[PDB]
């Protein structure tokens, strides 16, 4: 939290709307790491109304600037709060302040050239407690695109492929939520069918011996970016209406 500000950050987050205000609430009913339920007292509870509000804050929402906004809940349990109360702990906020940055101890002196003109000398301490560690959430996607040479579909059936790649894929071809990812790891594996072959005695023998691929499906797979690694936070999918794959 910012130690010495200008007195405004309370409102600067209040009207900003990255946190939740307690719209017509009297006491806390249920508190959860995924939402908050509050029972409205009968004085302000509308007739014929539930008298309960469910503010379902969404953690780990990939906001505009590719940052990592994850609203946190303020209360713990049964906290009595009036209307408009600060209920959500927002990104770079702490109990209702524009908590933008770290309050670090420093001392004034030049030394040993490492602070020549405009340098800051962070010793191993702030490395240890790792205050000011950066958070990020970044996305990617793939498409199916039923094609003329043949529709590309997420079947994880990659011919002439190393087995370890498929170790993280699903039957849908998706990766299960919570996996680790480094390098060019396959992400969404489609297979675009190619032009059909003739009798093709060489290819006929190839299909007789190995088969099931015949180079018919060419790799239409998605892979992880080069030099971008991480852990899969969350997924989503949208298919054209009438297509009912829905494997994973």
């Amino acid at each position: 939290k910012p130690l010495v500000g200008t007195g405004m950050e309370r409102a600067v987050a209040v009207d900003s709307g990255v946190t939740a205000v307690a719209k017509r609430g009297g006491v806390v009913q249920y508190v959860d790491a995924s939402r908050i339920v509050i029972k409205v007292n009968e004085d302000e509870m509308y007739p014929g109304e539930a008298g309960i509000d469910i503010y379902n804050l969404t953690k780990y929402t990939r906001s505009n600037q590719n940052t990592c906004i994850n609203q946190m809940p303020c209360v713990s349990l049964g906290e009595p709060v009036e209307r408009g109360d600060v209920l959500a702990d927002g990104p770079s906020t702490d109990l209702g302040e524009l908590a933008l940055g770290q309050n670090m101890r420093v001392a004034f002196m030049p030394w040993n050239g490492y602070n020549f003109e405009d340098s800051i000398l962070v010793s191993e301490r702030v490395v240890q407690e790792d205050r000011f560690t950066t958070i990020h959430i970044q996305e990617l996607a793939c498409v199916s695109r039923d094609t003329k040479l043949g529709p590309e579909e997420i079947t994880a059936d990659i011919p002439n492929v190393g087995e370890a790649a498929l170790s993280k894929l699903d039957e849908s071809g998706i990766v299960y939520i919570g996996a680790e990812v480094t390098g060019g790891d396959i992400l969404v594996g489609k297979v675009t069918p190619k032009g059909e072959t003739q009798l093709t005695p060489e290819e006929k023998l190839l299909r007789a011996i190995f088969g099931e691929k015949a180079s018919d499906v060419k790799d239409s797979s998605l892979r992880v970016p080069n030099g971008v690694s991480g852990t899969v936070i969350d997924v989503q999918v949208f298919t054209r209406d009438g297509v009912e794959k829905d494997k994973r």
Binding site: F108, M109, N112, G113, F116, E117, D118, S119
Partner: protein, 352 residues
């Protein structure tokens, strides 16, 4: 596979292959230099204060460019022409390209100073263990009256130097800095308060006398020595170091009455609005000059020190004043604005 044997091989290769570096907007021939590449465990480049100003960057969000001499001729030329270890003097003005302008100047300044008479003021010795008498105990760079037998060397003989032993008295720091100094220059250069232009004069004279090799040796030694000694000083800043001269609060008040007087004239119709404006402007300028003089005197070498006389007005020790004096950073004009009035500073576009 990222083999450590590969790391060893790369280090063996990285030994004898220089590289080239340049800054973003090329303006001078000083933008790009060549140097020996050294690997460093991080995600940025490490630059000595050697090519700093020539690089024209400012330790802020910036980028540099690295160039790999592939052809042997490329390497030979870059170590021959692009090598920073040859661009000593600025090709255009003729002055040194490498002009030490960092806090190392402040450190060398702190070397050659003397408050009035510090601990062991009357100490006289030979000099070699003065490093002990200062670092261990006994002497300070700010000490006076430290007599020492100085073994200078003047190349009076045709292409030959002759040594000479004297008993010069000086401060601890100046005599110490004399140790890393080369052989040629007389110690009279080492008798000073070590300002920035003094450093410039020293560098130029050294370039005149010896030659580039010992010159570079001395330059780097000066870099290291400054980075050390100034570190021994710290030299912080604070609210109290800037001292407000109380006289302004009176002097300005006086000028205030002056303006009213001019205003009274405008009330009488005797002074033209332009005439009244000019008179008020002159009065304000005079008051500003007087207040600036007062602030300077308050920040001048005006401090009484306890001694046998107990009234010893010596050089003040405020950061801004000493730094401006030697030449480290900031401006006396900058200081006056920060402590006295900032000045007129009135121009919507051209007007006052």
């Amino acid at each position: 596979r990222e083999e450590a044997v590969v790391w060893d091989i790369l280090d063996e290769v990285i030994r004898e292959h220089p590289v080239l570096l340049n800054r973003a907007p090329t303006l001078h021939r000083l933008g790009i230099q060549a140097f020996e590449p050294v690997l460093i465990e991080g995600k940025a480049i490490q630059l000595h204060p050697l090519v700093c100003a020539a690089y024209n960057a400012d330790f802020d969000g910036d980028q540099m460019a690295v160039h790999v001499p592939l052809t042997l001729e490329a390497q030979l030329e870059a170590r021959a022409l692009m090598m920073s270890t040859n661009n000593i003097l600025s090709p255009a003005n003729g002055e040194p390209i490498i002009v030490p302008s960092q806090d190392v100047v402040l450190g060398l300044y702190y070397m050659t100073r003397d408050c009035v008479n510090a601990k062991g003021e009357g100490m006289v010795l030979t000099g070699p263990k003065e490093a002990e008498r200062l670092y261990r105990s006994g002497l300070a760079s700010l000490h006076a009256r430290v007599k020492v037998r100085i073994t200078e060397y003047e190349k009076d003989a045709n292409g030959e130097l002759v040594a000479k032993t004297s008993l010069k008295d000086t401060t601890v720091g100046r005599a110490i800095l004399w140790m890393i100094v080369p052989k040629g220059l007389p110690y009279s250069i080492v008798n000073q308060a070590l300002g920035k232009k003094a450093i410039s004069k020293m560098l130029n004279t050294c370039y005149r006398i010896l030659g580039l090799k010992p010159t570079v040796i001395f330059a780097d030694q000066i870099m290291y020595t400054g980075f050390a000694y100034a570190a021994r000083s710290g030299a912080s800043v604070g609210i109290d170091d800037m001292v407000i001269p109380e006289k302004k609060h009176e002097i300005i008040s006086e000028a205030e009455a002056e303006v009213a007087e001019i205003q009274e004239q405008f009330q009488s119709g005797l002074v033209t609005a332009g005439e009244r404006y000019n008179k008020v402007i002159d009065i304000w300028a005079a008051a500003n000059d007087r207040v600036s003089k007062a602030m300077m005197d308050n920040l001048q070498t005006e401090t009484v020190i306890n001694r046998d006389g107990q009234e010893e007005k010596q050089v003040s020790f405020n950061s801004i004043y000493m730094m401006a004096d030697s030449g480290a950073r900031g401006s006396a004009a900058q200081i006056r604005q920060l402590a006295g009035m900032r000045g007129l500073m009135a121009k919507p576009d051209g007007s006052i």
